[PDB]
Symmetry: C3
Subunit: 288 residues, 3 copies
């Protein structure tokens, strides 16, 4: 049932997609790296995984086929399927000048090493604009997936490069559900026409997908709150909650359920709906 | 010469990491524990060894089984390095659950691309599979996160790099290392499945060999200090005296070994150091 | 640009093995050197990680010049100089494990070699590394990196400059103040030859170091003149780039902005210019 994506493909007058050639459980058909612009120098969004020689061949084929070169490299987040190929591109895709690699900083800030260590990131900020011939990209800070997660708005198409915030097929993972839901709510306000995700096919129904993503998490949150508000006098452990909430989940997915539940509890805790205690087996309980 | 895929018992299959080297001997010993269609995998080899993934696929096909979960002894890249490779190459219905002890003090530990996370265990935790029960044994010394596992059905220890099947191992803290060896002795295990080298059938004799080896050198160092209790010694003074029968090409190994021994005796309040630019060591009393 | 052959005897004491890692920052590749005249020699730098071609070249060099590795000396932490450590240990067979020497990071940091079981032996400025037919004095040259080590081959009056001085073109650095100071220190050595980390051999050492000093000093004079002429004015990084880097194209704006900031941090450290706490403007002092 998963779509078979081609290694090099012209998606629009301004976007060309090169597959990372790194399929897997977390990357789907591979990392979707994009060449944005209409001129002889284009912006490269993401670089795939480290040491994938097939991607360098595909990237060289796209640049030759579309008679273009890399202007600069923009990385959505630190995950190695988006930032791993930076060193490989610098060494293999010959250029007059060294490449400029832009990214959002880590939150809190951290030293991030590129290649051998002589190359450094140029850090951007929310609302920054990246310009090329025929394309203007506005930087949209979308934390949740990662603390440095950057989505980009292609103004000329009203298109979003969502990175790993929104995927072309299936759902995604995140570190913080509170920031993730807030980023989805912010992307909704852009009212974008198309989403170019970090993995999976192109999304033509942006509003419906983001709303599907919000509803999926909200239904589970409503289930968890109902349990707490119906049993206000009980302090529940994670194991207690997992057995009640994820009753329709098999035992082989216990650790995934436990992890999902904790992401939901940290969101409700941050919102002040539930409080935890300092017990060795941490207990959660409804307040007020 | 260890063969790459081998059934060691009714519950254990050894898959070699295909990463031989000075520190890994013939390669990392990874083990498939259990008797059912889903087994526990202990250690994963090094990063980017495609030969190991082929050997692991051969074992799973040969023994008509699959991975239930992955258990990592310690953070060293010959033990935790192949996780990303297994997740990408050994196809499964669900993503793998990777279990390990936390770092001490705690640290962020990145698996693969960064989207996979460790499920952290604690000392005494039990990992169950069809036909096998593994008790988690915290054995620090080699590393601050080192885990040994007790296979209850065989009274067997998966020692990781705490105990090797040939020669000795390295460690960070001699005090914790010696304490872990003393703890493993109390288990009174029948067999040891080490992280490198062949299987150990006389567990008691091997752990006692490891303890005695370190204790002989500690006794030599302590005797020098307690006999010359009014004297203070520099590291270079002590290396020339203690490691007299060791060649000059092994000087840095000797100096390193001595310092590991001196930090244990210092922790034990048997010796004390001073604030001199060339640090001097004297017996306590 | 000169075409360097992979294995070459440059001296009665020095033999160079190319890293087989050409690129924008490494030129024709990392220059790794075998120093000494005996059956055991010192290896300066190890190339990049996972370059199988380099291990073949290194094995050819050791066979051709009937020698072996005594110890490994790393100029700095950059992966094109410390990357091949694990590959050499695994592939170039030896009786004992290799001793890998380096200067510490400043401030100190955990530095992982290979799988994690190997550790660096840290040196200090002025330390001497001896082999049959060669004596190397450790020269702490920070600037390029905070751990950067240059070495003086006493018999030849030669400098293994690492990434401080390159055979062709310019180099990059983290701190211009320390970099300029290290170049001034290397000038005092009055070396005959310079064996760089990348590029061909430097036969006119004085002229090369003075070319490297003059290149940075011309730009510093340009910046300082702008500040001293407009002593009442305060400038931002964007204001200063547009004025100073007038002869730099818009495609190199981020490189210019980065270069400028390295120059401003040196002048700030020297108390020639001062910054403010504005959401940032530099003014004369
Ligand atoms: Zn991704
Ligand atoms: Zn991601
Ligand atoms: Zn090991
Ligand atoms: Zn180990
Ligand atoms: Zn360097
Ligand atoms: Zn270099």
């Amino acid at each position: 049932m998963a779509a078979v994506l081609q290694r090099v493909e012209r998606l629009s007058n301004r976007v060309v997609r090169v597959l990372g050639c790194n399929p897997g459980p977390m990357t789907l058909q591979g990392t979707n790296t994009y060449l944005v612009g209409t001129g002889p120098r284009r912006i490269l969004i993401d670089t795939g995984e480290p040491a994938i020689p097939e991607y360098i061949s595909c990237l060289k084929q796209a640049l030759t086929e579309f008679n273009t070169a890399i202007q600069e490299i923009v990385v959505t987040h630190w995950h190695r399927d988006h930032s791993g190929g930076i060193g490989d591109i610098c060494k293999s895709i010959n250029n007059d000048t060294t490449y400029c690699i832009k990214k959002l900083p880590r939150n809190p800030q951290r030293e991030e090493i590129i290649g051998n260590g002589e190359q450094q990131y140029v850090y951007l900020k929310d609302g920054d604009v990246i310009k090329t011939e025929g394309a203007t990209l506005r930087v949209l800070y979308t934390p949740g997936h990662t603390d440095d997660h950057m989505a980009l708005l292609l103004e000329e198409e009203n298109a979003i490069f969502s990175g790993d915030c929104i995927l072309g097929e299936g759902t995604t993972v995140f570190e913080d559900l509170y920031d993730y839901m807030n980023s989805l709510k912010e992307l909704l306000k852009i009212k974008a026409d198309i989403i170019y995700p970090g993995h999976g096919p192109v999304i033509h129904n942006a509003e419906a997908k983001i709303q599907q993503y919000i509803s999926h998490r909200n239904i589970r949150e409503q289930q968890i709150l109902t349990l707490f508000r119906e049993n206000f006098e009980k302090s529940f452990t994670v194991m207690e909650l997992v057995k009640i909430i994820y009753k329709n989940t098999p035992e082989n997915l216990h650790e995934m359920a436990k992890h999902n539940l904790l992401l939901h509890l940290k969101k409700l805790e941050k919102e002040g709906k539930i409080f935890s205690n300092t017990d060795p087996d941490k207990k959660w309980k409804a307040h007020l």
